[PDB]
Design a protein around this motif. Structure first.
Motif, PDB file in Angstrom:
ATOM      1  N   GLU A  64       4.239   2.170   3.040  1.00  0.00           N
ATOM      2  CA  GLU A  64       2.266   2.461   3.132  1.00  0.00           C
ATOM      3  C   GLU A  64       2.192   3.334   2.336  1.00  0.00           C
ATOM      4  OE1 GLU A  64      -0.220   2.506   6.779  1.00  0.00           O
ATOM      5  OE2 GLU A  64       0.565   3.833   7.152  1.00  0.00           O
ATOM      6  N   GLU A  65       2.601   4.422   2.146  1.00  0.00           N
ATOM      7  CA  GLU A  65       1.948   4.802   1.483  1.00  0.00           C
ATOM      8  C   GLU A  65       1.304   4.079  -0.361  1.00  0.00           C
ATOM      9  OE1 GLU A  65       4.279   7.747   3.489  1.00  0.00           O
ATOM     10  OE2 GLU A  65       3.669   5.693   3.419  1.00  0.00           O
ATOM     11  N   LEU A  88      -1.703   1.830   0.100  1.00  0.00           N
ATOM     12  CA  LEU A  88      -2.535   2.384   0.669  1.00  0.00           C
ATOM     13  C   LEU A  88      -3.164   2.604  -1.057  1.00  0.00           C
ATOM     14  CD1 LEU A  88      -1.805   4.117   3.253  1.00  0.00           C
ATOM     15  CD2 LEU A  88      -3.827   2.781   2.806  1.00  0.00           C
ATOM     16  N   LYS A  89      -2.166   2.413  -2.529  1.00  0.00           N
ATOM     17  CA  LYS A  89      -2.735   3.090  -3.535  1.00  0.00           C
ATOM     18  C   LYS A  89      -2.744   1.462  -4.498  1.00  0.00           C
ATOM     19  CE  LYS A  89      -1.837   7.353  -3.531  1.00  0.00           C
ATOM     20  NZ  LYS A  89      -0.796   8.583  -3.971  1.00  0.00           N
ATOM     21  N   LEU A 102      -4.022  -1.723  -3.880  1.00  0.00           N
ATOM     22  CA  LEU A 102      -5.368  -2.475  -3.944  1.00  0.00           C
ATOM     23  C   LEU A 102      -6.376  -1.657  -4.227  1.00  0.00           C
ATOM     24  CD1 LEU A 102      -4.914  -4.329  -0.849  1.00  0.00           C
ATOM     25  CD2 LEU A 102      -3.905  -4.969  -2.897  1.00  0.00           C
ATOM     26  N   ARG A 103      -7.626  -2.227  -5.499  1.00  0.00           N
ATOM     27  CA  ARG A 103      -8.232  -1.307  -5.704  1.00  0.00           C
ATOM     28  C   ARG A 103      -9.774  -1.772  -5.802  1.00  0.00           C
ATOM     29  NH1 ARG A 103      -6.542   3.843  -7.077  1.00  0.00           N
ATOM     30  NH2 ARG A 103      -8.717   3.991  -8.401  1.00  0.00           N
ATOM     31  N   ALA A 104      -9.819  -2.612  -5.310  1.00  0.00           N
ATOM     32  CA  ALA A 104     -11.427  -3.819  -5.510  1.00  0.00           C
ATOM     33  C   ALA A 104     -11.345  -4.593  -5.123  1.00  0.00           C
ATOM     34  CB  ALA A 104     -12.263  -2.847  -6.948  1.00  0.00           C
ATOM     35  N   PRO A 105     -12.374  -5.076  -5.317  1.00  0.00           N
ATOM     36  CA  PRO A 105     -12.689  -6.225  -4.730  1.00  0.00           C
ATOM     37  C   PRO A 105     -14.220  -7.216  -6.414  1.00  0.00           C
ATOM     38  CG  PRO A 105     -14.730  -5.784  -3.383  1.00  0.00           C
ATOM     39  CD  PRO A 105     -13.537  -4.682  -3.793  1.00  0.00           C
ATOM     40  N   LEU A 149      -3.853  -4.101   5.451  1.00  0.00           N
ATOM     41  CA  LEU A 149      -4.626  -3.720   5.447  1.00  0.00           C
ATOM     42  C   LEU A 149      -5.617  -4.340   5.401  1.00  0.00           C
ATOM     43  CD1 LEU A 149      -3.677  -1.417   2.089  1.00  0.00           C
ATOM     44  CD2 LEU A 149      -3.920  -0.315   4.143  1.00  0.00           C
ATOM     45  N   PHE A 150      -5.795  -5.919   5.232  1.00  0.00           N
ATOM     46  CA  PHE A 150      -6.723  -6.626   6.442  1.00  0.00           C
ATOM     47  C   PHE A 150      -6.083  -7.725   6.659  1.00  0.00           C
ATOM     48  CE2 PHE A 150      -8.177  -7.152   2.051  1.00  0.00           C
ATOM     49  CZ  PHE A 150      -9.256  -5.963   1.520  1.00  0.00           C
TER      50      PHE A 150
END
Ligand SMILES: NCCC[C@H](N)C(=O)O
Ligand SMILES: [K+]
Ligand SMILES: [K+]
Ligand SMILES: [K+]
Ligand SMILES: [K+]
Ligand SMILES: [K+]
Ligand SMILES: [K+]
Ligand SMILES: [K+]
Ligand SMILES: [K+]
Ligand SMILES: [K+]
Ligand SMILES: [K+]
Ligand SMILES: [K+]
Ligand SMILES: [K+]
Ligand SMILES: [K+]
Ligand SMILES: [K+]
Ligand SMILES: [Mg+2]
Ligand SMILES: [Mg+2]
Ligand SMILES: [Mg+2]
Ligand SMILES: [Mg+2]
Ligand SMILES: [Mg+2]
Ligand SMILES: [Mg+2]
Ligand SMILES: [Mg+2]
Ligand SMILES: [Mg+2]
Ligand SMILES: [Mg+2]
Ligand SMILES: [Mg+2]
Ligand SMILES: [Mg+2]
Ligand SMILES: [Mg+2]
Ligand SMILES: [Mg+2]
Ligand SMILES: [Mg+2]
Ligand SMILES: [Mg+2]
Ligand SMILES: [Mg+2]
Ligand SMILES: [Mg+2]
Ligand SMILES: [Mg+2]
Ligand SMILES: [Mg+2]
Ligand SMILES: [Mg+2]
Ligand SMILES: [Mg+2]
Ligand SMILES: [Mg+2]
Ligand SMILES: [Mg+2]
Ligand SMILES: [Mg+2]
Ligand SMILES: [Mg+2]
Ligand SMILES: [Mg+2]
Ligand SMILES: [Mg+2]
Ligand SMILES: [Mg+2]
Ligand SMILES: [Mg+2]
Ligand SMILES: [Mg+2]
Ligand SMILES: [Mg+2]
Ligand SMILES: [Mg+2]
Lengths: 102, 62, 34, 77, 46, 93
Positions: free
Chosen positions: F4-5, F8-9, F11-14, F50-51
RNA sequence: CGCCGGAAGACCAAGGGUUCCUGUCCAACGUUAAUCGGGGCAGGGUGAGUCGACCCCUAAGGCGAGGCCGAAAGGCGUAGU
RNA sequence: UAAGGUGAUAUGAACCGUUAUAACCGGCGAUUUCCGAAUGGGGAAACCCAGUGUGUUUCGACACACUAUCAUUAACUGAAUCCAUAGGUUAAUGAGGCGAACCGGGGGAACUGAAACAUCUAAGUACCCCGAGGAAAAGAAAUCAACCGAGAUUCCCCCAGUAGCGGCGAGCGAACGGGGAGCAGCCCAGAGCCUGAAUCAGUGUGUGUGUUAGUGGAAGCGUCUGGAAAGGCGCGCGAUACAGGGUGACAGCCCCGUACACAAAAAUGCACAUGCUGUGAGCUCGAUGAGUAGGGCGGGACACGUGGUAUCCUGUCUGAAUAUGGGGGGACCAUCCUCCAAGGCUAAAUACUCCUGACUGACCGAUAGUGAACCAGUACCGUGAGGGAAAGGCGAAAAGAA
């Protein structure tokens, strides 16, 4: 280890504002201070349409050299020099002319 | 910090490390959507992950 | 070779320009003092 | 290489001197031959690449004494 | 007409690339000389 | 699984454009800026967690950075990876 | 109106690397002017189980554990790669 | 250590801190992607592909570790071939690559000079290769001297441009002896007694001193000119501090320093002292380095070019005597003197500076000084090795022109 600090009452020794007194707004890492009402310049400020700031002849303070001011001894009414001594465990500043702690 | 996190053990430090990375992901989505005004929060969360991972190694390898 | 010319860095061998016997229009009947 | 295994002789350099004393570089090679030596201590033939002078060292010292200095040097036969 | 430089990236890297320089002792002295001069590009590479 | 860590790294931005907004309207596709060494299996497992949506397929491409001349220095922007994430037709965001 | 049309049309490899598209600007660059541009600045744009690479397999050839040879550096070469 | 901070171009935004967990400086730690000796295999450097073993799993998969070659040692195996050996697998330890000069060794030019040129010179120089260290090499007489004596090696000044060598041309060029720097001697080729009695190496502890951040540090205002005073004029003060730098023009007393006096939680270099392990001193007796010395042939080194040529080294062929004996004293012989080869170790005086700190200059001041005072080994040129620039200055303050 600095002899002139913020919020100190200083007197100017050199320049066009020689002999005038004021309070230190901030010290700069250049070895310069900004003193209230001392070393005033007129900056012709350009307008920018963000910020809601229009242009104009703005009067601000310019930085004077830190060796051009001295601490103002309010007891004697003169420019004085600063030494360092250990009252308690900690260092203090004192006036040279009467050895009284600032 | 760094003294409040020394008085936790390794699984509570693993719990807090995951909470900090979840907040770091949420600050990224706000800063990349123009919605984060407090940009000083990005440096704070980044250096707290560094604190937690420092303490996890000096409990295991020590 | 002329390897560090600052006026003409693109060319190293230039005597086909000004030396008369190395031009492409040089004829050997110009050398008749023989 | 042209190295004797027993004595350690190798090619050395010198001059060809003519009658007018012109000097030209030449080499001096050792008189190397490959020879199988009977080892009575092992019932086995050992092949070495030796000079003709190295054969006279083996004839004087014995083949086992020579092979012991070959192990101490770290030479592999 | 046909000039002398006809580029080819495979022939460039096989002839003067980094592993071609590291394969012989004389190529390794080319890299020592270029490091001693302090050059920003050691070899003709990518 | 994965870690999971690691998730969390990734995806950066939409990503914001007219092609990115057309793809959500007509094709049901969000366009994201992802990590450079991310894989399609890592992006799919990160969006679904995450979504909390359901992903049908991931298409990726590498964008090459532009060479810009700032003042007189000749510089270059970095590369980045772009993902086209197709959601299932009962979707969100 | 004129010109090419086994190309001066279309699609690629090699090579180049953003020259592509949109907005904006005209100092310099463009053998003239420029409102235009392959020029300046900003933003956007390249989506694959099936196409290609990578991958499996070898040619010429290269490198080459041991090995054989060579003042040294090295040379050649087997199994392999 | 501190009242201010978040490196620079370079502002702004958003924040942190002010009597101590802001920032800054120092010691010890942690983390430390990929390429590169690059070492799991491969490769067009910064990429591609695995094997094995543990652990996990939401069953789709993940996370970590190990796996190069060679040398040495050990274990287990193991042919032709009976014993065996070669070979194979595994484990432990070490090496590998880089770096400016200095050092030792293996190879080794030509231009040039000779007013040509071949012996000779340049020169064992340039260059290539191997290896080592903080220095290296050398080193404890089979040495010199001259009938008197000196006493290992290395470096400096003489001896001396002498004695000699030399197409006796161009050129090359000592030693003996003298003055200095520095100074140091041992071990194996072996047994007995006495043992662990000297010394050295490693480590622990204590002490001393130094290094790696720091602390304090004296004494000046009146007036004139001026944009501005540190200058002119007047009157004072400090000095173990008038080295130096800065400040609106030239400051001992405005600022930073300077002389002087102090400072270490932690790491570390030396200097002893001491603990531990390893090493073993001393006496008697014995022994005294053989394919070697020497020789023939061919070369090389000695200032010495084969000359009347001693001495050293050895490619090739030979080949002794063993202190009742050998080596040398410049062909050689006799006499006399002097020293013991064929095993090994060793500090100092000496050489050098990629790098760090301080200080100095009848050194340079932007066509100079490094190629480079400036984002320079860059732009640019070249397939590549490689070549290689130009370009410093507003003002005291941006007060950089509303
Ligand atoms: N090999 C071609 C080099 C070309 C170069 N500019 C010249 O003039 O020689
Ligand atoms: K013989
Ligand atoms: K124009
Ligand atoms: K033109
Ligand atoms: K090495
Ligand atoms: K010559
Ligand atoms: K001449
Ligand atoms: K001639
Ligand atoms: K002698
Ligand atoms: K002084
Ligand atoms: K001064
Ligand atoms: K001898
Ligand atoms: K002689
Ligand atoms: K200049
Ligand atoms: K220059
Ligand atoms: Mg699809
Ligand atoms: Mg794709
Ligand atoms: Mg970048
Ligand atoms: Mg027509
Ligand atoms: Mg462009
Ligand atoms: Mg266009
Ligand atoms: Mg024009
Ligand atoms: Mg166009
Ligand atoms: Mg354009
Ligand atoms: Mg442009
Ligand atoms: Mg394929
Ligand atoms: Mg081969
Ligand atoms: Mg060699
Ligand atoms: Mg490899
Ligand atoms: Mg590898
Ligand atoms: Mg190396
Ligand atoms: Mg050698
Ligand atoms: Mg001549
Ligand atoms: Mg010579
Ligand atoms: Mg030595
Ligand atoms: Mg102080
Ligand atoms: Mg100490
Ligand atoms: Mg003896
Ligand atoms: Mg000779
Ligand atoms: Mg002669
Ligand atoms: Mg004699
Ligand atoms: Mg005599
Ligand atoms: Mg210059
Ligand atoms: Mg000038
Ligand atoms: Mg090029
Ligand atoms: Mg130039
Ligand atoms: Mg220049």
């Amino acid at each position: 280890a600095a002899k002139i600090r913020r919020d100190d009452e200083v007197i100017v020794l050199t320049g066009k504002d020689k002999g005038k007194r004021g309070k230190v707004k901030n010290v700069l890492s250049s070895g310069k201070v900004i003193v209230e009402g001392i070393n005033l310049v007129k900056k012709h400020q350009k307008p920018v349409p963000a910020l809601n700031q229009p242009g104009g002849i703005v009067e601000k303070e310019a930085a004077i050299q830190v060796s051009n001011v001295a601490i103002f001894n309010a007891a004697t009414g003169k420019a004085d020099r600063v030494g360092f001594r250990f009252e308690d465990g900690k260092k203090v500043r004192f006036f040279k002319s009467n050895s009284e702690t600032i | 910090k760094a003294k409040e996190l020394r008085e936790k053990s390794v699984e509570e430090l693993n719990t807090e490390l995951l909470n900090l990375l979840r907040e770091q992901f949420n600050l990224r989505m706000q800063a990349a959507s123009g919605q984060l005004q407090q940009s000083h929060l990005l440096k704070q969360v980044r250096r707290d992950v560094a604190r937690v991972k420092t303490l996890l190694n000096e409990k295991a390898g020590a | 070779m002329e390897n560090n010319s600052r006026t003409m860095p693109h060319i190293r061998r230039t005597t086909h320009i000004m030396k008369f016997a190395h031009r492409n229009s040089f004829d050997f009947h110009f050398f008749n003092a023989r | 290489s042209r190295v004797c295994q027993v004595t350690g002789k190798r090619p050395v350099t010198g001059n060809n001197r003519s009658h007018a004393l012109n000097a030209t570089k030449r080499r001096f090679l050792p008189n190397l031959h490959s020879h199988r030596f009977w080892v009575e201590s092992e019932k086995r033939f050992v092949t070495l690449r030796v000079s003709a002078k190295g054969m006279r060292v083996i004839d004087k010292k014995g083949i086992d004494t020579v092979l012991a200095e070959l192990r101490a040097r770290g030479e592999k036969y | 007409m046909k000039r002398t430089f006809q580029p080819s990236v495979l022939k460039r890297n096989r002839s003067h690339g980094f592993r071609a320089r590291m394969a012989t002792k004389n190529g390794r002295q080319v890299l020592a000389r270029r490091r001693a001069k302090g050059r920003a590009r050691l070899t003709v590479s990518k | 699984m994965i870690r999971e860590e690691r998730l969390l790294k990734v995806l950066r931005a939409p990503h914001v454009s007219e092609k990115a907004s057309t793809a959500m309207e007509k094709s049901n596709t969000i366009v994201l800026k992802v990590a450079k060494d991310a894989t399609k299996a890592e992006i799919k497992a990160a969006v679904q967690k995450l979504f909390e949506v359901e992903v049908e397929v991931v298409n990726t491409l590498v964008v090459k950075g532009k060479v810009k001349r700032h003042g007189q220095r000749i510089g270059r922007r970095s590369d980045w990876k772009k993902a086209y994430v197709t959601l299932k037709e009962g979707q969100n965001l």
